[PDB]
Design a binder for this molecule. Structure first.
Ligand SMILES: [Br-]
Ligand SMILES: [Br-]
Ligand SMILES: [Br-]
Ligand SMILES: [Br-]
Ligand SMILES: [Br-]
Ligand SMILES: [Br-]
Ligand code: NI
Ligand code: NI
Ligand code: NI
Ligand code: NI
Ligand code: NI
Ligand code: NI
Lengths: 117, 117, 117, 117, 117, 117
C-alpha cells in the first residue's frame, strides 16, 4: 500500500476509517452540543479523507489491467465509492456512511476474489 | 480540491508536483554524492505522492458522471497517470517523470474542455 | 519547492489555495446549515495554512539575495501576504480572501520578472 | 481511533502497517540496487511510524483503567511493542518485523477479550 | 524525538502545545461568535493531538526499561497524561488544559532526573 | 503558534528541531552503514523542515510591524535562518546545524526582548 511495491494491501483500511465515519454520524444524532458537533465534524472530515486515500490506493497501486478487464465496472465502482465517501463527509446521516461502507464492501469482494486467483 | 465542495480545481497542482519529480530525476544524474542521492530519493517519493493525490482528487472530486459519459477513456487515463507517477517514484530515469507529465497533459486538455461546456 | 533544490517553483500553488479560501468564504454566505458552516471552517483553515506554506517556501527557497536587493519591499510584501492569509483564515468575509489574493498577485508579478533576468 | 470518542478501534490498523514493514525488509534482501534500498528504507520508516501511532492510540484512547487492572502487563506490552517497531525501523532483518507483529498479536488478543465486555 | 535515535528529547515540546490548548480554552470564554468558537475548537483538537504525540514519543522512544524500573508509576503517569489531553480536547474548560499541563510537569521532572544519569 | 490567535509562541520549538538536526549530523559522522545513513537523511530532512515551519510561524504570526520597525534586520535574519536550515538539511556537517542554531539564537534573543517590552 506504500508504493515500493511492498505488496501488502487490505480494503480493511478503507473499511475501518469508513466505519469511524458512520460511528461519528451516529453519535452526532445523540448530542446537539455545538462544541461536540464541531469536534465530530472535524474528526469525520479527517477519517473520510483517509478512507478515500485508502480506496484510491487500492485502485492505483493494487489493481492492475487484468483486473480492469475481468471487472469492467471496477473503475466506476471505485469512482462511486469515493463520491459516496465525499457524500458521507458532507452529511450527518449515518445512512450515508453506510452507503460508502456498502461500496467498499463491493470493492472488498472483488479484492479478495483477485487474491484467490 | 478541499471537498467542501469549494469548486476550485486545476491540474496545474498535479503538474507542478510531477515537474518536481522529473527535475529531481534530472539532478540525480548530475551529482553522485550518496547523501545527495538519498535526499533526492526522499524528495522524489514525497512529490510523486502529492502528484498522485492531486490527480486522484480531480478524478473523484471534480469530474462528474456527464464528464465520464463524454470521455469514456477518462477513468483508464486517470489510472494510467497514477501508475505512471508510481513508476516515476520508483525510477531515477527522467523519461519516467516525462511519461507521468504527458498523461497529466492529457487530463489537463480534458479538464479545460469541461470548463467550457 | 521541495528544498533539494529541484528549482521548480510557481506562485500558482499559493494562488490556487488562496482561491479555495475565498471560494469557501463565498459559500458560507450561501448556506446557514451549522454542519456546513463547520465543514467550511475546517476546510478554510487547512487551505489557508497550505497557502501560507507555499508563500513562505517561495520566500525562503526560491528568492535569493540578488532578488532582495532588486526588490527591497519583497520581505515586507511576503510578510503582509502571510498576515493577509491569517486574516482570511479568521474571517468569513470574502473581501479578506481577495486581499490575500491581491498580495499573492504582487508576489507573482515579481516572481515572473526574476524568471526573465 | 480518532478521539471523539467514536469508539471504533481495531489493532488490524497497526498489524497491516507492521506487515508492510516486514514485507519491505524481505524485499530488501532481493534487490541490492542503491536507489531501491533507499526507497525501501524511506517507506519502512514511514510505515513503522504509522504502526506506532496506531499502537499508541489504542493504548491512550481505547484502553481504560479497568483494562489496565485486568491486564497488569498491558502497559509494558504496549511499550515493548513500540520499541519492537523502532527496532524494525532501524533494521533490514525481517525477524525484527516479525517480532513487532508477534507483539501486536498479543495486543490484538487482549483487545478482543475486552470487547467481549 | 525523531527515532534514529538522535537522542534529542524535551517534554517542552508537549508543554508548549498543551499551553496552546489551555490558551484556546481561555479565549473561548470571551468571544461567543460561532465562527470563532468553531476555529478555536478546530485548533484545540490539532494542538491537543500534537501534545499527545510528543508525550507518546517520549514514553516509547526516550524512556527505557531502567527508567520504568526506577519509576514504577511512569507508565500510568504517561497514560493519565494522554487521557488528560483527550479530556482537554473534549472540553472548553481551561481547568482541563491546566490538568494536562500538571501531568506534563510530572513527566518533565522525571525526564530531567533521568538526564542526570 | 496555531493561528487563532492563541498567543503562545516560543522559539524553543524551532530550536529543539534544529538541535535534532545537528545531533543527527553528529551521528552520521560516526557510523557509515548505508541503511543508517539513509535513515539519518530521512529524519534530518523532516526535522529541518519542521524547524523552518516554526521559524516561519514566529515571523508571520508572532512578529508585528512595530517589531519590524524596532528591528529592521529581522526580516533578513528570518530569511537567512531559513536558508541556514535548508543548508543544514542538505549537509552532513554538524557545523551547518550549529550555524542554523546560531541564527535561531539571534531570533530567540529578539523574541524574548519583545516579551519584556
Ligand atoms: Br505497493
Ligand atoms: Br470540491
Ligand atoms: Br528547491
Ligand atoms: Br477515543
Ligand atoms: Br529515539
Ligand atoms: Br497565533
Ligand atoms: Ni505498501
Ligand atoms: Ni476544494
Ligand atoms: Ni522543490
Ligand atoms: Ni476514533
Ligand atoms: Ni529524535
Ligand atoms: Ni497558536
Amino acid at each position: 500500500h506504500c508504493d515500493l511495491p511492498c505488496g501488502v494491501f487490505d480494503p480493511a483500511q478503507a473499511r475501518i476509517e469508513a466505519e469511524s465515519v458512520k460511528a461519528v454520524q451516529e453519535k452526532m444524532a445523540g448530542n446537539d452540543d455545538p462544541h461536540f458537533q464541531t469536534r465530530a465534524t472535524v474528526i469525520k472530515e479527517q477519517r473520510a479523507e483517509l478512507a478515500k486515500h485508502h480506496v484510491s490506493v487500492l485502485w492505483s497501486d493494487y489493481f492492475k489491467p487484468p483486473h480492469f478487464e475481468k471487472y469492467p465496472e471496477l473503475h466506476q465502482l471505485v469512482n462511486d465509492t469515493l463520491k459516496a465517501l465525499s457524500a458521507a463527509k458532507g452529511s450527518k446521516d449515518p445512512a450515508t456512511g453506510q452507503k460508502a461502507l456498502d461500496y467498499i464492501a463491493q470493492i472488498d469482494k472483488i479484492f479478495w476474489e483477485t487474491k484467490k486467483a
